[PDB]
Amino acid sequence: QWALEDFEIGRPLGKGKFGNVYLAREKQSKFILALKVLFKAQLEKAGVEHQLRREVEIQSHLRHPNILRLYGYFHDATRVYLILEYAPLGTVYRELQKLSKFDEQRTATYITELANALSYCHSKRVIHRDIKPENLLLGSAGELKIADFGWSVHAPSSRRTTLAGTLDYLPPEMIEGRMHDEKVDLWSLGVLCYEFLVGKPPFEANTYQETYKRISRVEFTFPDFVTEGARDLISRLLKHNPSQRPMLREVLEHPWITANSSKPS
Ligand SMILES: Nc1ncnc2c1ncn2[C@@H]1O[C@H](COP(=O)(O)OP(=O)(O)O)[C@@H](O)[C@H]1O
Ligand SMILES: CCOc1ccc2nc(C)sc2c1
Ligand SMILES: [Cl-]
Ligand SMILES: [Cl-]
Ligand SMILES: [Cl-]
Ligand SMILES: [Mg+2]
Ligand SMILES: [Mg+2]
Hints:
One of its GO terms (biological process) is protein autophosphorylation. It is an enzyme of class 2 (transferase). Belongs to the protein kinase superfamily. Ser/Thr protein kinase family. Aurora subfamily. The protein is of the alpha+beta class and 265 residues long. It folds into 2 domains: 2-90, Phosphorylase Kinase, domain 1 (2-Layer Sandwich), CATH 3.30.200.20; 91-261, Transferase(Phosphotransferase), domain 1 (Orthogonal Bundle). It has helices at residues 40-46, 49-61, 92-99, 104-122, 172-175, 183-198, 208-216, 228-237, 248-252, 255-260; strands spanning 7-15, 20-26, 32-39, 70-75, 79-84, 126-127, 136-138, 144-146, 153-154. The strands form 3 sheets. Strands 1-2-3-5-4 form a 5-stranded antiparallel β-sheet. A hairpin with a 3-residue loop joins strand 4 and strand 5 (79-84). The radius of gyration is 19 Å and the shape is globular. The protein starts with 6 loop residues before the first strand and ends in a 5-residue tail after the last helix. Bound molecules: adenosine-5'-diphosphate (ADP), 6-ethoxy-2-methyl-1,3-benzothiazole, chloride ion (CL) (3 copies) and magnesium ion (MG) (2 copies).
């Protein structure tokens, strides 16, 4: 169906390990969108064809205001192209580096949006497993949208693919290569809440080896300015035992979230 000839390409929107993402306009409709380009040579080398198929299959059937749309895909002799909804206000990552830290109202509102999206995903037993600021995009009204479903799967699951970069958002069961389920996304939600309020993730360190250590032992502390409500929520999410982490309804109904969020469940 779609082919490269159908689009006018514009400015680079960002880069990933495999993804190179561009603004684009479809020629006869003038529809503005984002084109995610992947190189087949690099995909075959890393052996991650199965991850891309899951990305397309999982993300194209989800429909939620806080999840980025995937409309389709095409490919030629050297490249694969994913046709995505364009997110005009950029990444939460860029926003955090602009402001250093988020206030309590901004943080709680982002957490509500994230928990709504994740609740919808978990109702289909879909787990994202790669929730982090560079994969959270912003729509035209500043609303958060989850993107980048390359690591997503159906629970329960193991891991058959090498962990590439940062350990910072992963739970103990995941980094220890053990068995895992939906509760992994709840751990990540805790890491994000901390990073939004403080400016850095709670297990950050100078080496892989030591980050692994801080995560497996759940070794984190709070700066003085983090309030008692925020501390309570984060402490509940960052539990070593997955079955002790709260359900998402409990997150959405936590007194600190209800007091500070400007959006409903
Ligand atoms: N739909 C989009 N709208 C705007 N920017 C995007 C969009 N998709 C990706 N980006 C930008 O490109 C980067 C890489 O996209 P991503 O899909 O996460 O690739 P990878 O799978 O390589 O991580 C993002 O972190 C973001 O900066
Ligand atoms: C949903 C389609 O996924 C695809 C399609 C083509 C393709 N070519 C590769 C080398 S990896 C791959 C994945
Ligand atoms: Cl498996
Ligand atoms: Cl895997
Ligand atoms: Cl729930
Ligand atoms: Mg990404
Ligand atoms: Mg990816």
